[PDB]
Each structure stands twice: as structure tokens, then as C-alpha cells.
Amino acid sequence: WKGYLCLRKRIQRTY
Amino acid sequence: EVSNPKKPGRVTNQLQYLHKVVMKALWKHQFAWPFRQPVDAVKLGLPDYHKIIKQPMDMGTIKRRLENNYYWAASECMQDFNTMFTNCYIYNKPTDDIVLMAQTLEKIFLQKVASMPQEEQELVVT
């Protein structure tokens, strides 16, 4: 929810 | 990685317990979504992940392995779970948010494993 890797992981999830 | 024709696999009571009880409890957890797929180092811009982590592992890979009877014994499957948790701890900082999600899943993992059948026994279809 705040980390670079976790947010980048979250962006790719919506794709 | 997921399938191997030259390596023997088995169905045991402990392996089916990991697939029916342990995996289903961790898979639907709210913190499970980062661990359901292999880490895509290209999409996430991680040029050092595969050079620090020598054996990637995710819940999706473990689940496919149980569904294909990849493992011979439960110890091989529990090593995959440990490998997945260790990769998150090594690569990330101990204070990272993704590490707290892995530790939450690891405690649940150790909780479910504590109720696994004590002795491993092979399951043969008749």
C-alpha cells in the first residue's frame, strides 16, 4: 500500500 | 519448474492436506495477491531480483505443482512455501509493507501445518 514494489505490483494487477 | 517428466511425483495425505486446507486458506487471504503469481521483474522494473533470488517461487507455482502431482513428499512442498517467504524477506527491507503481508501469511501457514496429519501416507487411486 505504500512500498514501491507493492504499488508497482498493484498497478500491474489492474492490467 | 511446474512440470517434469523425468522426476517422480506422488499423492500423499500431507500433500493433499497442503492443497485442500493450507493452500485454500492462504490463496483467498487479503494479503495473498502479491504472492499468487511469479515476480515479473521486467514489468516491475527489478533488474536485480533474479540476480539476488536464485530460485523464484510463488503460490501459483506451488498450486500448479500440487495439481500436477509434482511433489514426491510434503517436505518438498513446504520447502517451496519457505522459499517464497524467504525471497520476500531477503529482497525487501524488514520494515517494508510487503514483508508484513508475507509474515501474516507465514504465521497462518505455520498454524495450518500444525494440524497436518502426523505421518505421511501415500494416496493411491483404485
Numbering used by the authors:
A (entry chain D): 1 to 15
B (entry chain A): 65 to 190
What does the primary publication say about this deposited structure?
Within this class of proteins, the bromodomain and extraterminal domain (BET) family contains four members that are transcriptional coregulators and that recognize acetyllysines (AcKs) using a tandem pair of highly homologous bromodomains (BDs). Despite heavy academic and industry investment in this area, the generation of paralog-selective inhibitors has proved elusive because of the extremely high sequence similarity between the bromodomains of family members (90 to 95% within the acetyllysine-binding pocket residues). Using the highly conserved BET BDs as a model system, we conducted three mRNA display-based RaPID (random nonstandard peptides integrated discovery) screens using a single library (which contains >1012 unique members). Crystal structures of 13 distinct peptide–bromodomain complexes revealed highly diverse structures and binding modes among the cyclic peptide ligands.
We also solved structures of another lariat-type peptide, 4.2C, bound to a BD1 and a BD2 domain. In contrast, 4.2B and 4.2C are members of smaller families that are detected only in the BRD4-BD2 selection. In line with this observation, 4.2B and 4.2C showed significant selectivity for BD2 domains over BD1 domains. Surprisingly, however, the helix in this case runs in the opposite direction from the other two structures. Together, these structures demonstrate that the class of lariat peptides that we have isolated is predisposed to take up helical conformations and that such peptides can bind BET BDs with affinities that are comparable to those observed for β-hairpin peptides. A helical scaffold appears to be particularly favorable for BET BD binding and, strikingly, this property is independent of the direction of the helix but rather a consequence of the ability of a helix to juxtapose a set of side chains to engage the pocket region.
